[PDB]
Amino acid sequence: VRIKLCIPTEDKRQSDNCDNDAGQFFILGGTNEMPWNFAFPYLHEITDTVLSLGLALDSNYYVTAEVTAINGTLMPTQTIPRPIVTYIPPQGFKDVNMVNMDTSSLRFRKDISSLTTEEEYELRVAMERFMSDKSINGYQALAEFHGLPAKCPRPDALNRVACCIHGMATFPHWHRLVVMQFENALFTRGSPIGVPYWDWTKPFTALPSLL
Amino acid sequence: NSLTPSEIENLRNALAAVQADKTDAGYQKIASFHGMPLSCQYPDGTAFACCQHGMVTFPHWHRLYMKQMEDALKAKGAKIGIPYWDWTTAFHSLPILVTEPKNNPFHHGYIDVADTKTTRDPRPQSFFYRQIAFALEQRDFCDFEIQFEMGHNAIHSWVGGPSPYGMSTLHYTSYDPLFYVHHSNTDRIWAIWQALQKYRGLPYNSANCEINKLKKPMMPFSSEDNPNEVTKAHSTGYKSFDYQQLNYEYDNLNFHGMTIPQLEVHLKKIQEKDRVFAGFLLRAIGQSADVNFDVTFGGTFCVLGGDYEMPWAFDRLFLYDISKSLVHLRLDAHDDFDIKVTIMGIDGKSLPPNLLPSPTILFKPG
Amino acid sequence: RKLSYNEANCALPLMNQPMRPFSNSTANNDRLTFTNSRPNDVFDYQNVLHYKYDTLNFAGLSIPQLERILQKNQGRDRIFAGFLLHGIKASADVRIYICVPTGIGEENCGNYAGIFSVLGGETEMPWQFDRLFRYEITDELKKLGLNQNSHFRVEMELTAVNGSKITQKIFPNPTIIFVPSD
Ligand SMILES: *[C@@H]1O[C@H](CO)[C@@H](O[C@@H]2O[C@H](CO)[C@@H](O[C@@H]3O[C@H](CO)[C@@H](O)[C@H](O)[C@@H]3O)[C@H](O)[C@H]2NC(C)=O)[C@H](O)[C@H]1NC(C)=O
Ligand SMILES: *[C@@H]1O[C@H](CO)[C@@H](O[C@@H]2O[C@H](CO)[C@@H](O)[C@H](O)[C@H]2NC(C)=O)[C@H](O)[C@H]1NC(C)=O
Ligand code: CUO
């Protein structure tokens, strides 16, 4: 597996600078091989070449892999899960601060139990109207975002998959955004609250009466 | 504002104290430098007014000048720094210290050269807020200064009015206690900006335009005859950027109600809407005058200047948003318009015509 | 041009089969169109179909000065993209892009050059063009500072009328033809 270091393309054209190769490694295997998977990621240091190209270790770039079988046969990229860049900051480093205090309003997401009956009814109405009825700006579209009308990478064409991120470090980013969508959707339809949460961490006997 | 007696209390006496040192200056020498009595010489030794406005190194000179002044209350119970009043924040009236008629050191100054105390003649959302915020918007230092200087002198125009002995004039302004206090503020504004940059990773204690001029030393702060060691040390341009080694502190660099980070959000927020500006070329003229805009009212802005001042010309244009004017006429920056202006002298007359050339008119999205 | 205007040398077996709906006794009952169902009969519209066009000048240009424009157009070096087209199952829209390599390393691709359309529907009679369709890409290459000798290539990007639903390559790759000055 040859390691190519790529610099992303802005435009439609596939102009991604993958010219400069960052690394290289090898894999022993065979037929009637014992099935196996390292329980931990293999890390191949690319810091030096990343420094050579004059782009910060922090900044955006990616890594692609050329898998050549020992047979000499060039192999499909699908053979191996795509490489990732892992960044190790100078310890210790505090990431940038949050914005000071609060002003003048933020959507407040409460425990479902903390909801007054009024709040229950009002976000019930918001949900009721968002859901009923259907549109492009409606509930079913957002419900469709996550999974199975399969619009990924694009709703075209040949092979489509679910859009939601799973088995990745970016899972919670994706679903955070999604929850924000839901929030806007309910706010514009007339609810004073941010989307409430239910602690499943707290021991519970039954589902909240809300759902 | 927010002062607690006797915090107010200590100071008058200190200002009182230096009214006559009067040896070092004691205060009149300290006054002369911005003021009328002649600071320096061309090599021909001709009178100059050692005023360092109109140039890019404009803040340092002053920001110092506060220092010289600031030091001057030294161990005279100069227990806190010169206060600042945020003229940005709209105000129905002037601030006390400089108003109270009786037994107050801030009412006026005197002038051995003229035999008189200062006379001031005030003249009639907040205008300065809008004007300053723009300055903050900018990222180039030079770009910032032009607006920063012009936002500034708008007050030397309006505080003084039509008295030769006053804040409207270069000659005797420095004499009026009101002048420093206005400054602290002007200086404060500058500081805020530095914090801004710093936030943005742009240079703040440095500045890339123009390398020319920050290096020229500054008189009088240069002069041998300045018996304060400190200012001479930073008499230079490039020193005096980091006001930290002064050493003073502002209570808080927050524009009204805004974290610095908050502030950028604000400006960033403003920036969404596409704007339209007018920019003038301004250049030296002996007199000091105010200029009134038109297309409805678009005005206005003022220029500070006096006899025997070093001539100056700004490198860059001075911008003044006139979008509210267009909406007023319902124009789209598309329909095309005549930008009409007027330009009064501080003395009662007389709106002489440019002088300044023609205003360009430019559009910023968005 | 003194070249045949009411006859066609180019297609010979096709000019004598009467038009299939117009030759069908049902449901074409108009004797005019029925009688002239053959292509050859439809060549002269004026004598046969009894109509005229108000002016035959195009773009306000009389036919002599039109032919002049055409020939002066032939005057310069031009570059064309050739397309071998045939019947898709349905109608689709093809866009034309020009790929210019950067020095290091191997490189692509698109700046927008053109667009043309292909018509169709299910149950259409199958068809294959026996010659290239040409698309002048000369001026776009001029705007890229490119040449006929300069290194570059031409890619088509095909979008169905379904609504997006971009298609994989169904047509042979674009030819590049150079025509020297007249
Ligand atoms: C709009 O999108 C669909 C998405 O597939 C296009 O697919 C077309 O679908 C037809 C049948 O729905 C396909 O026909 C099939 O062809 C294969 C052989 O390739 C044959 O084994 C099947 O029995 C069937 O006949 C067709 O391949 C496919 N055509 C293309 C190029 O998309 C549909 O065509 C699109 N609609 C339009 C406007 O063309
Ligand atoms: C001439 O046209 C007629 C119809 O215009 C053809 O007869 C059929 O018409 C029915 C009407 O519903 C259609 O369902 C059939 O499909 C038509 N013909 C078929 C079955 O092909 C008639 O066939 C045509 N004659 C010729 C030889 O073209
Ligand atoms: O499923 Cu993807 O979100 Cu819990």
What's the N-to-C CA distance of chain C in angstroms? 17
Q: How far is CA C121 from CA C21, C88, C89, C90, in A?
A: 18, 8, 6, 4
Closest CA to C7 of C37, C43, C42, C50: C43
Residue in the block written with tokens 């030393």 = B217
Q: Kindly state the DSSP code that residue A79 receives in the 8-state scheme.
A: G
* Residue A194 CB neighbours (<10 A): 18
Cα A166 to averaged position of ligand 3 atoms, centre (Å):
8
Cβ contacts of A114 within 8 Å, gap of 6 or more? A196
Query: How many whole angstroms separate alpha carbon B162 and alpha carbon C95?
Result: 71
State yes or no: cis peptide before B32, omega within 30 of 0: no
Which of C23, C25, C26 to probe ligand 2 with, by most ligand atoms within 8 A of CB? Answer: C26
DSSP C4-37: -SS--SS--SSTTSPPHHHHSTTT---HHHHHT-
Distance from CA of B130 to the nearest CA of A (A): 21
Asked if residues C160 and C68 have their Cβ atoms less than 8 Å apart, the reply is no
Interface probe, candidates A58, A97, A100, A104, chain B, greatest B C-beta count within 10 A: A100
Please judge whether A155 and C104 are an interchain contact, meaning their C-beta atoms are less than 8 angstroms apart: no
Query: How many whole angstroms separate alpha carbon B72 and alpha carbon B69?
Result: 5
Which of A164, A181, A200 to probe ligand 3 with, by most ligand atoms within 8 A of CB? Answer: A164
Asked if residues A42 and A25 have their Cβ atoms less than 8 Å apart, the reply is yes
- Tell me which ligand sits closest to the C-alpha of residue C18: 2
**Last residue before each break in chain B (C–N > 2.5 Å):** 124, 295
Q: Is B265 on the interface with A (CB under 8 A)?
A: yes
How would you label A151-174 residue by residue, b for 16+ Cβ within 10 Å and e otherwise?
eeeeeeeeeeeebeeeeeeeeeeb
Cα B126 to averaged position of ligand 3 atoms, centre (Å):
50
- What are B277's strand-pairing partners? B321, B362
Query: How many whole angstroms separate alpha carbon B321 and alpha carbon B286?
Result: 27
Please judge whether A11 and C106 are an interchain contact, meaning their C-beta atoms are less than 8 angstroms apart: no
Q: Tally DSSP H helices, then E strands, for chain A.
A: 4, 4
- Dihedral, CA of residue A177, residue A179, residue A182 and residue A184, to nearest 10: -60
Where do runs of H (alpha helix) occur along chain C? 20-23, 31-35, 45-49, 63-74, 138-143
- Diameter of chain A measured on Cα atoms: 70
Query: How many whole angstroms separate alpha carbon C149 and alpha carbon C151?
Result: 6
Residue in the block written with tokens 């980070």 = B261
Query: How many whole angstroms separate alpha carbon B22 and alpha carbon B29?
Result: 9
In the sheet with B360-364, reading across from the earlier edge strand, the strands are B318-321, B275-280, B360-364
Verify whether ligand 1 is closer than 6 Å to residue C160 (CB atom): yes
State yes or no: cis peptide before B354, omega within 30 of 0: no
Asked if residues C150 and C94 have their Cβ atoms less than 8 Å apart, the reply is no
Closest CA to A15 of C111, B201, C49, B274: C111
In this structure, the residue with its CA closest to atom 11 of ligand 1 is C89
Asked if residues A72 and A10 have their Cβ atoms less than 8 Å apart, the reply is no
Whether there are 3 or more C-beta pairs closer than 8 Å between C and B is: no
Structure tokens at A67: 């898998």
- What are A65's strand-pairing partners? A3
Cα C122 to averaged position of ligand 1 atoms, centre (Å):
10
Q: Which amino acid makes up residue B299?
A: G
Q: How far is CA B174 from the centre of its chain?
A: 12
Query: How many whole angstroms separate alpha carbon A141 and alpha carbon A131?
Result: 10
Q: How far is CA B185 from CA A42, B63, B84, B192, B253, in A?
A: 58, 10, 5, 10, 10
Query: How many whole angstroms separate alpha carbon B220 and alpha carbon B31?
Result: 11
Query: How many whole angstroms separate alpha carbon A75 and alpha carbon A79?
Result: 7
Query: How many whole angstroms separate alpha carbon C156 and alpha carbon A184?
Result: 41
Asked if residues C71 and C104 have their Cβ atoms less than 8 Å apart, the reply is no
Q: How far is CA A168 from CA A76, A174, A175, B94, B195, in A?
A: 22, 10, 12, 62, 38
Structure tokens at B330: 């319902």
Please judge whether A19 and C166 are an interchain contact, meaning their C-beta atoms are less than 8 angstroms apart: no
Query: How many whole angstroms separate alpha carbon A157 and alpha carbon A136?
Result: 21
Q: Is B357 on the interface with A (CB under 8 A)?
A: no
Q: How far is CA B5 from the centre of its chain?
A: 28
Residue in the block written with tokens 């900006």 = B193
Please judge whether C104 and A13 are an interchain contact, meaning their C-beta atoms are less than 8 angstroms apart: no
Q: Which atom of ligand 3 is nearest to the CA of A164?
A: 2
State yes or no: cis peptide before B311, omega within 30 of 0: no
Closest-CA residue of chain A to B265: A99
- Tell me which ligand sits closest to the C-alpha of residue C27: 2
Cβ contacts of B331 within 8 Å, gap of 6 or more? B337
Q: Which amino acid makes up residue B349?
A: K
Asked if residues C110 and C98 have their Cβ atoms less than 8 Å apart, the reply is yes
Interface probe, candidates B262, B263, B268, B269, chain A, greatest A C-beta count within 10 A: B262
* Beta-sheet pairing, B116-117 with B110-111: antiparallel
Q: Which amino acid makes up residue B85?
A: W
Q: How far is CA B224 from CA B19, B50, B227, B236, C48, in A?
A: 23, 14, 8, 14, 110
Asked if residues B38 and B48 have their Cβ atoms less than 8 Å apart, the reply is yes
Query: How many whole angstroms separate alpha carbon B195 and alpha carbon B189?
Result: 10
Query: How many whole angstroms separate alpha carbon A150 and alpha carbon B185?
Result: 60
Using a CB-CB cut-off of 8 Å, the residues of chain A touching B265 are: 99
Chain A with chain B: Cβ pairs closer than 8 A: 9
Cα A136 to averaged position of ligand 3 atoms, centre (Å):
22
Query: How many whole angstroms separate alpha carbon B264 and alpha carbon B187?
Result: 19
In this structure, the residue with its CA closest to atom 2 of ligand 3 is A164
Query: How many whole angstroms separate alpha carbon A203 and alpha carbon B3?
Result: 55
Q: Which amino acid makes up residue B16?
A: A
Q: Which amino acid makes up residue B175?
A: Y
Cα A175 to averaged position of ligand 3 atoms, centre (Å):
7
Torsion sign over Cα B119, B181, B293, B328 = negative
Helix (H, G, I), strand (E, B) or coil at B228: coil
**Is residue C52 packed enough to be buried (19+ CB in 10 Å), middle (13-18) or exposed (0-12)?**
exposed
φ/ψ region of B257 (left if φ > 0, alpha if ψ in -120 to 50, else beta) reads: left
Please calculate the CA angle B97-B98-B104 and round it to the nearest 5 degrees: 70
- Dihedral, CA of residue B134, residue B263, residue B192 and residue B177, to nearest 10: 70
Please judge whether A15 and C107 are an interchain contact, meaning their C-beta atoms are less than 8 angstroms apart: yes
Query: How many whole angstroms separate alpha carbon B239 and alpha carbon B241?
Result: 5
Cα C122 to averaged position of ligand 2 atoms, centre (Å):
17
Closest CA to B303 of B339, B342, B346: B346
Q: Kindly state the DSSP code that residue B193 receives in the 8-state scheme.
A: H
Which of C86, C89, C168 to probe ligand 1 with, by most ligand atoms within 8 A of CB? Answer: C89
Query: How many whole angstroms separate alpha carbon C138 and alpha carbon C152?
Result: 13
**Is residue B254 packed enough to be buried (19+ CB in 10 Å), middle (13-18) or exposed (0-12)?**
middle
Structure tokens at C22: 């117009």
Distance from CA of A151 to the nearest CA of C (A): 11
Resolution in A: 3.0
Helix (H, G, I), strand (E, B) or coil at B15: helix
**Is residue B130 packed enough to be buried (19+ CB in 10 Å), middle (13-18) or exposed (0-12)?**
middle
Cα C125 to averaged position of ligand 1 atoms, centre (Å):
17
Structure tokens at A75: 């192999």
Using a CB-CB cut-off of 8 Å, the residues of chain A touching B253 are: none
Cβ contacts of B15 within 8 Å, gap of 6 or more? B73, B105, B106, B177
Structure tokens at C159: 């979008």
In this structure, the residue with its CA closest to atom 18 of ligand 2 is C26
Query: How many whole angstroms separate alpha carbon B301 and alpha carbon B298?
Result: 10
Asked if residues C118 and C92 have their Cβ atoms less than 8 Å apart, the reply is yes
Please judge whether A15 and C102 are an interchain contact, meaning their C-beta atoms are less than 8 angstroms apart: yes
Whether there are 3 or more C-beta pairs closer than 8 Å between A and C is: yes
- What are B309's strand-pairing partners? B49
Phi and psi at residue B117, in whole multiples of 5°?
A: -80, 160
